[PDB]
Design a protein around this ligand. Structure first.
Ligand SMILES: [Ca+2]
Ligand SMILES: [Ca+2]
Ligand SMILES: [Ca+2]
Length: 434
């Protein structure tokens, strides 16, 4: 965590903007949490900050004999003396889903029940380092995530899976359109070797897109190797990649990258609520993370890195649209933005789409298109990264981006076009970085 904090610029958010996640509640569904008791026996990283601790997989036992859930929660918000999480003043809702067999049998058949329970406790961010290796398929769980996000303002994150490096290996429910799906780059701890030596390396095991219907997943990346975080007092050494001390130890996986981003989302949500005066929709938090992310060097579009590695300080200051307009087929929304040469111009359009059928060959339901016109008349369409930039239109993704590395100074015209909206109207969010 301490190194990952610097990589994703959570340090700048903390020290310069004062964003520690205070007043935000993050829910974690994972194996268990240290002793499983909300009392003075609990690990220092979480003692005193647990809103609710629910035992789903084993009756009245939310402890963590595995160590995965304690480590994950630690990276979101641990507030122990060392190795803090990204949002150490956020409060925790923990749903213990591990069963007596070490399986994830505490998950309900309808995931909306899981999310509802956490929502009723106050959580508005829900992070999940679990999934099924279904090679990019959109399953009933994916459908249920998408319906839940469209109806409730809960931001839900899923790990991409650990079945890389082959393409097409994204886990479900990480294949959901309306979730933020997170893959893993490397942490910078090079004395541990090649898995932790270049922050612009995708971790070899991180699952890679596209999804079965051709969408870009994961959405964003964060460090996921040799992450030092909270060690459950009941977990054995074999659960960790390396020891550190009795209270903290190392783990790696897309399970580790996901909670780092969840904590960053709590910092970003805090910023919008306290400093920008709005409650941001899930689509806007997603668009802000994507517009601010860094190309790790592979270029776009790319199923290995998605839209790049989270860079939180860029995401804080975006110009935005927060689901303030909704469109039906053939309508358009038009905005103007004055850009400065000298810094890249990145514009991201994101919408929480209608859930698809699991029998559909194409999961996108409502198709919006992003069209940007530059001061000298050049036009750019969403996700077209080959010149000319206005001949390849996107009909698959519910994220569309226009990234211009060397913009003209002057006013750009931003149009959001409703190409086909059968389940309308459809709202959207926009985030602009310059
Ligand atoms: Ca490496
Ligand atoms: Ca489109
Ligand atoms: Ca093109």
């Amino acid at each position: 965590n301490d190194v990952a904090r610097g990589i994703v610029k959570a340090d700048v958010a903390q020290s310069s903007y004062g964003l520690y996640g205070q007043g935000q509640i993050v829910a974690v569904a994972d194996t268990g949490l240290d002793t499983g008791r909300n009392d003075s026996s609990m690990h220092e990283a979480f003692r005193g900050k647990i809103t609710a601790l629910y035992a789903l997989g084993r009756t009245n036992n939310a402890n963590d004999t595995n160590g995965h859930g304690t480590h994950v929660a630690g990276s979101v918000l641990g507030n122990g003396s060392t190795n803090k999480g990204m949002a150490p003043q956020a409060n925790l809702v923990f749903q213990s889903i591990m069963d007596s067999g070490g399986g994830l049998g505490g998950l309900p058949s309808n995931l909306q029940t899981l999310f509802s329970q956490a929502y009723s406790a106050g959580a508005r961010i829900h992070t999940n380092s679990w999934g099924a290796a279904v090679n990019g398929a959109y399953t009933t769980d994916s459908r249920n995530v998408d319906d839940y996000v469209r109806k409730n303002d809960m931001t839900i994150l899923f790990a991409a899976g650990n079945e890389g490096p082959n393409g097409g290996t994204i886990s479900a429910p990480g294949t959901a359109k309306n979730a933020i799906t997170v893959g893993a780059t490397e942490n910078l701890r090079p004395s541990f070797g090649s898995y932790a030596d270049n922050i612009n390396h995708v971790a070899q095991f991180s699952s890679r897109g596209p999804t079965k219907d051709g969408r870009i997943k994961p959405d964003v990346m964060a460090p996921g190797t040799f992450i030092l975080s909270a060690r459950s007092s009941l977990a054995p050494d074999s659960s960790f990649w390396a020891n550190h001390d009795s209270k903290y130890a190392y783990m790696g996986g897309t399970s580790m990258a996901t909670p780092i981003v969840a904590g960053n989302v709590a910092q970003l949500r805090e910023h919008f609520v306290k400093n920008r005066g709005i409650t941001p929709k899930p689509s806007l938090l997603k668009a802000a993370l994507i517009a601010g992310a860094a190309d790790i060097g592979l270029g776009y579009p790319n199923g290995n890195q998605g839209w790049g590695r989270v860079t939180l300080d860029k995401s804080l200051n975006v110009a935005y649209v927060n689901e303030s307009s909704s469109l039906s087929t053939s309508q358009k929304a038009t905005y103007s933005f004055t850009a400065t040469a000298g810094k890249p111009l990145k514009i991201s359009l994101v919408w929480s789409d209608a859930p698809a059928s699991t029998t559909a060959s194409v999961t996108l339901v409502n198709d919006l298109d992003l069209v940007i016109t530059a001061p000298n008349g050049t036009q750019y369409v969403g996700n077209d990264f080959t010149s000319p930039y206005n001949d390849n239109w996107d009909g698959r993704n519910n994220v569309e981006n226009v990234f211009i590395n060397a913009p003209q100074s002057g006013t750009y015209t931003i149009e959001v076009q409703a190409y086909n909206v059968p389940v309308g109207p459809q709202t959207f969010s926009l985030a602009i970085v310059n």
